[PDB]
């Protein structure tokens, strides 16, 4: 029993994070095979990254340019391109530490864990969502660029962002690891806003789910509602609108508790239009909404 | 910027964690040197749980009765004792991934990560504090026990907790690695009620401070108040007691920002009495209490 805010593993990661620094910017990069990935933005200066044309920076920088370092072994640089705002590093040494590992672009929603680093060296985990606006809330210092979140499937890490950038109100900015941005932000040192920060619907849901198999139950009343008529409610509290794809998805949780999906969104209406009353779910005074209902399964079942 | 409950990188526990099965009950155990740790429960039947005389249980159990897993490989028991309510199995192969490592029994109020574990297999790694009341709030299904609990301090790991036990409240119970309980509790399906849950103030407040250095700063208000006066409230609101001892921990957080630590002392004061009204610190409805004013620091500067 209990219900925490769980990261996977991370010891699978740990063993592909490098040190990558070129000219005076140093950050993190990621070692799979005999490729090291890294921001591109280490090749700027704070100065370049006004508005850096990455294509030009890049003329000046050779193979030995790149200083890459895997604990205290330094790594030879045999070629490098860009590929969208990431570097490729093609090392001489494949990483003895490679997992099976792919690379997947999420949807807003989907969650996943980060091992956030400091000159190649892990330093905590914690677990993220991709919020709908694709920001995410994490705990990025200077130097953690070239972190990675993750998820696992028993020996397969699916590696599905980079840390590159923090917006002037503090929420982050990343990368898939081909590269490309989530949602509309550059890898430049301008006016960046984030839309919405909308509630993950079918996560909160899925978080009641597992508040009711985990005992806290006292939210759950005798209504039950529509998809439309939730979602006229949902649209007014800035909640994402669900739909019949996430009924379909929270299913098994519905199953194993005997709680149809509607009658779970009739008791999120409820506390939507009441609020808490200074009661907690879970241990939460809000509505938790970066668990996934795969994570309340996983957690709820212990996958490992 | 951000602030994230973090858990420890585990990977250094990742190599650590084997399978421990006496008869037809499998847990975890941990692996240091040559030397296999789980909990003692292991030699019961849930019949025998409910009173069970564990030096007479451990007479009918010999070396080959343990059957100690790492990966898919056996490892050969050549010896085994019981200290306190942890079984020690002398293995004949020192685990080679043997991190630095210290065993340490943490005072109520410190933090640690657990990883959790089943048949000897990493699921998840999230935060926990020593509660007051020397349980724990974790996230622990049936073969989980023997899952542990630690800090890392740059290379050294310090061990301070492995899983026993679930009270009937779905709170958690366990031992340090020389196997004695924290609090009262003991190894035996009986009624085990916890104390008063109070919430750790020294955290709430190194809390409060990670919440300016991030920018969440409403709560700040004109008022100071004095250690005895604040305590009158504590008392009231089933917080701690503050000492001099907690004012001191929180000089630093007090230096980086400002705030003497009486006037955060004010501040939380104010929230106690008037409540969060609606509104949200570092994205908590709740004051948050699992970080130490060491936590505060170490996510606010980076350290890995
Ligand atoms: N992609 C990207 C990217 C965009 C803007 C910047 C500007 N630098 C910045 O925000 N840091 C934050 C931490 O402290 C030092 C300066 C850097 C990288
Ligand atoms: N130390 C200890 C200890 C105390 C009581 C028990 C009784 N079993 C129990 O609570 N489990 C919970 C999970 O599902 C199956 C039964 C076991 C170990």
Redesign the interface.
């Given at each position: 029993?209990?219900?925490?805010?769980?990261?996977?593993?991370?010891?699978?990661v740990?063993?592909c994070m490098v040190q990558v620094t070129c000219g005076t910017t140093t950050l993190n990069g990621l070692w799979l095979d005999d490729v090291v990935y890294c921001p591109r933005h280490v090749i700027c200066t704070s100065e370049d990254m006004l508005n850096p044309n990455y294509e030009d920076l890049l003329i000046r920088k050779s193979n030995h340019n790149f200083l890459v370092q895997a604990g205290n072994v330094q790594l030879r640089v045999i070629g490098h391109s860009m590929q969208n705002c990431v570097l490729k590093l093609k090392v001489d040494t494949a990483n003895p530490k490679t997992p099976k590992y792919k690379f997947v672009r999420i949807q807003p929603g989907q969650t996943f864990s980060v091992?956030?680093?400091?000159?190649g060296?892990?330093?905590?985990?914690?677990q993220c969502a991709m919020r709908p606006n694709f920001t995410i809330?994490?705990?990025?210092?200077?130097?953690?660029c070239g972190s990675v979140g993750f998820n696992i499937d028993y020996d397969c890490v699916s590696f599905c962002y980079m840390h590159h950038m923090?917006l002037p109100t503090?929420?982050?900015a990343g990368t898939d690891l081909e590269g490309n941005f989530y949602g509309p932000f550059v890898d430049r040192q301008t006016a960046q806003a984030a839309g919405t920060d909308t509630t993950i619907t079918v996560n909160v849901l899925a978080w009641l789910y597992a508040a009711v198999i985990?005992?806290d139950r006292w939210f759950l009343n005798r209504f039950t509602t529509t998809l439309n008529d939730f979602n006229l409610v949902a649209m007014k509290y800035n909640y994402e609108p669900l739909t019949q794809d996430h009924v379909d998805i929270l299913g098994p949780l519905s199953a194993q508790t005997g709680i149809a999906v509607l009658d779970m969104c009739a008791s999120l209406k409820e506390l939507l239009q009441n609020?808490?009353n200074?009661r907690?779910i879970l241990?939460?005074?809000?509505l938790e909404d970066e668990f996934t209902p795969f994570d309340v399964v996983?957690?709820?079942?212990?996958?490992?």
């Open positions: 029993s209990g219900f925490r805010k769980m990261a996977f593993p991370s010891g699978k740990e063993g091992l956030a680093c400091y000159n060296s892990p330093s905590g985990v914690y809330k994490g705990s990025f210092l200077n130097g953690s923090e503090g929420v982050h985990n005992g609020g808490m200074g907690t241990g939460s005074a809000l996983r957690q709820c079942s212990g996958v490992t």
